[PDB]
Design an enzyme around this catalytic site. Structure first.
Site, PDB file in Angstrom:
ATOM      1  N   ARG A 162       1.859  11.736 -24.785  1.00 41.11           N
ATOM      2  CA  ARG A 162       2.059  11.844 -23.163  1.00 41.11           C
ATOM      3  C   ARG A 162       2.095  13.068 -22.564  1.00 41.11           C
ATOM      4  O   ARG A 162       2.986  14.079 -23.130  1.00 41.11           O
ATOM      5  CB  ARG A 162       3.022  11.023 -22.773  1.00 41.11           C
ATOM      6  CG  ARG A 162       2.913   9.232 -22.724  1.00 41.11           C
ATOM      7  CD  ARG A 162       4.082   8.219 -22.796  1.00 41.11           C
ATOM      8  NE  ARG A 162       5.226   8.967 -22.035  1.00 41.11           N
ATOM      9  CZ  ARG A 162       6.275   8.186 -21.631  1.00 41.11           C
ATOM     10  NH1 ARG A 162       6.480   7.207 -22.202  1.00 41.11           N
ATOM     11  NH2 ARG A 162       6.917   8.869 -20.594  1.00 41.11           N
ATOM     12  N   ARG A 222       7.081  11.990 -29.984  1.00 42.59           N
ATOM     13  CA  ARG A 222       6.799  10.579 -29.515  1.00 42.59           C
ATOM     14  C   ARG A 222       5.143  10.779 -29.761  1.00 42.59           C
ATOM     15  O   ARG A 222       4.597  11.559 -29.098  1.00 42.59           O
ATOM     16  CB  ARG A 222       7.279  10.167 -28.525  1.00 42.59           C
ATOM     17  CG  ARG A 222       6.793   8.880 -27.872  1.00 42.59           C
ATOM     18  CD  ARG A 222       7.948   8.452 -26.993  1.00 42.59           C
ATOM     19  NE  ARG A 222       7.713   9.244 -25.486  1.00 42.59           N
ATOM     20  CZ  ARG A 222       8.646   8.933 -24.425  1.00 42.59           C
ATOM     21  NH1 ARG A 222       9.672   7.897 -24.615  1.00 42.59           N
ATOM     22  NH2 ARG A 222       8.498   9.494 -23.226  1.00 42.59           N
ATOM     23  N   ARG A 240      12.669  16.714 -17.044  1.00 41.27           N
ATOM     24  CA  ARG A 240      13.127  15.235 -17.010  1.00 41.27           C
ATOM     25  C   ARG A 240      14.470  15.313 -17.457  1.00 41.27           C
ATOM     26  O   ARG A 240      15.222  14.523 -16.715  1.00 41.27           O
ATOM     27  CB  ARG A 240      12.324  14.483 -17.985  1.00 41.27           C
ATOM     28  CG  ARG A 240      10.668  14.201 -17.386  1.00 41.27           C
ATOM     29  CD  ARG A 240       9.972  13.732 -18.532  1.00 41.27           C
ATOM     30  NE  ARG A 240      10.284  12.587 -19.326  1.00 41.27           N
ATOM     31  CZ  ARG A 240      10.069  12.204 -20.548  1.00 41.27           C
ATOM     32  NH1 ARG A 240       9.194  13.404 -21.253  1.00 41.27           N
ATOM     33  NH2 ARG A 240      10.435  11.178 -21.003  1.00 41.27           N
ATOM     34  N   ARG A 294      17.651   4.613 -11.767  1.00 40.27           N
ATOM     35  CA  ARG A 294      17.662   6.014 -12.232  1.00 40.27           C
ATOM     36  C   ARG A 294      18.412   6.677 -11.031  1.00 40.27           C
ATOM     37  O   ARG A 294      18.654   7.970 -11.413  1.00 40.27           O
ATOM     38  CB  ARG A 294      16.197   6.503 -12.588  1.00 40.27           C
ATOM     39  CG  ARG A 294      15.433   6.110 -13.427  1.00 40.27           C
ATOM     40  CD  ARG A 294      15.960   6.247 -14.942  1.00 40.27           C
ATOM     41  NE  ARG A 294      14.932   7.259 -15.362  1.00 40.27           N
ATOM     42  CZ  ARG A 294      13.912   7.146 -16.082  1.00 40.27           C
ATOM     43  NH1 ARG A 294      13.352   5.863 -16.090  1.00 40.27           N
ATOM     44  NH2 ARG A 294      13.209   8.087 -16.555  1.00 40.27           N
ATOM     45  N   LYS A 336      15.550   4.060 -25.621  1.00 36.98           N
ATOM     46  CA  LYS A 336      15.905   2.657 -24.904  1.00 36.98           C
ATOM     47  C   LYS A 336      14.565   1.956 -24.909  1.00 36.98           C
ATOM     48  O   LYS A 336      14.909   0.495 -24.906  1.00 36.98           O
ATOM     49  CB  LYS A 336      16.181   3.231 -23.412  1.00 36.98           C
ATOM     50  CG  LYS A 336      17.611   3.894 -23.338  1.00 36.98           C
ATOM     51  CD  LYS A 336      17.613   4.397 -21.741  1.00 36.98           C
ATOM     52  CE  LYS A 336      16.457   5.067 -21.126  1.00 36.98           C
ATOM     53  NZ  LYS A 336      16.241   6.434 -22.043  1.00 36.98           N
TER      54      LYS A 336
END
Ligand SMILES: Nc1ncnc2c1ncn2[C@@H]1O[C@H](COP(=O)(O)OP(=O)(O)O)[C@@H](O)[C@H]1O
Ligand SMILES: Nc1ncnc2c1ncn2[C@@H]1O[C@H](COP(=O)(O)OP(=O)(O)O)[C@@H](O)[C@H]1O
Length: 203
Positions: free
Chosen positions: A150, A124, A161, A85, A13
């Protein structure tokens, strides 16, 4: 035109939003990016949000809704990237837009399976200087570029998550489907292809 990018974490996204904003002149509203800059600068919002994010939990709606009001631009096309969200946030977004004579035009739902989300998130990597997002396998950093992972892209936070996404965020799919503005994106495809689909969806 107002767009919302919806879907599991790691779907791609942010990558698509950044490209669409860059090439086509949309204002990119990433609640993710804004929160992280708040955390880094240690604002009242940043200090309050920090732990929710570290644990893979959603920051409280009141904080986020206010954040959106603070940043929503007076003019220009907008990409809502990672907001809403929750159902509460989606109701708030509608009211806010309605007061401005606006509405959500398209909700792009970035469909992608769990094995792909895990693969995408665990690889990532971030360029701390530029914010440029990479992936150790699919789009690796150039030789000599130091990147970071991260803390919330660690195995157990990803797992959280995803539960949180399925629990709190996934009901938005029926929410926007009921309005006739849900568009489906096959997010499992390569970056270039997803982007063509994004461009086709929105005209
Ligand atoms: N709209 C939102 N509402 C509540 N919390 C949010 C929102 N956007 C971001 N966050 C917080 O920031 C974290 C990272 O979000 P984000 O960067 O948008 O997704 P991803 O990490 O999948 O790219 C989330 O786990 C959440 O704690
Ligand atoms: N179409 C794609 N194919 C393979 N990897 C992708 C694709 N889109 C994004 N990625 C990579 O997967 C990870 C997740 O992308 P990102 O845009 O940060 O996801 P989101 O914003 O949905 O959390 C990043 O490391 C990114 O480089």
């Amino acid at each position: 035109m107002i767009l919302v990018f919806l879907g599991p974490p790691g779907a791609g996204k942010g990558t698509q939003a950044k490209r669409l904003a860059k090439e086509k002149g949309f204002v990119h509203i990433s609640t993710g990016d804004i929160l992280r800059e708040a955390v880094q600068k240690g604002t009242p919002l940043g200090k309050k949000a920090k732990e929710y994010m570290e644990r893979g939990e959603l920051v409280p709606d009141d904080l986020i809704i206010a954040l959106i009001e603070e940043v929503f631009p007076k003019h220009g096309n907008v990409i809502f990237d990672g907001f809403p969200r929750t159902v509460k946030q989606a109701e708030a977004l509608d009211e806010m837009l309605e007061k401005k004579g606006l509405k959500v035009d398209h909700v792009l739902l970035f469909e992608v399976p769990d094995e792909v989300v895990i693969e995408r998130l665990s690889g990532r990597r971030i360029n701390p200087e530029t914010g440029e997002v990479y992936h150790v396998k699919y789009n690796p950093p150039p030789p000599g570029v130091k990147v970071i992972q991260r803390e919330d892209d660690k195995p157990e936070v990803i797992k959280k998550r995803l539960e949180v996404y399925r629990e709190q965020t996934a009901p938005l799919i029926e929410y926007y489907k009921k309005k006739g503005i849900l568009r489906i994106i096959d997010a499992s495809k390569p970056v270039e292809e997803v982007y063509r689909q994004v461009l086709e969806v929105i005209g």
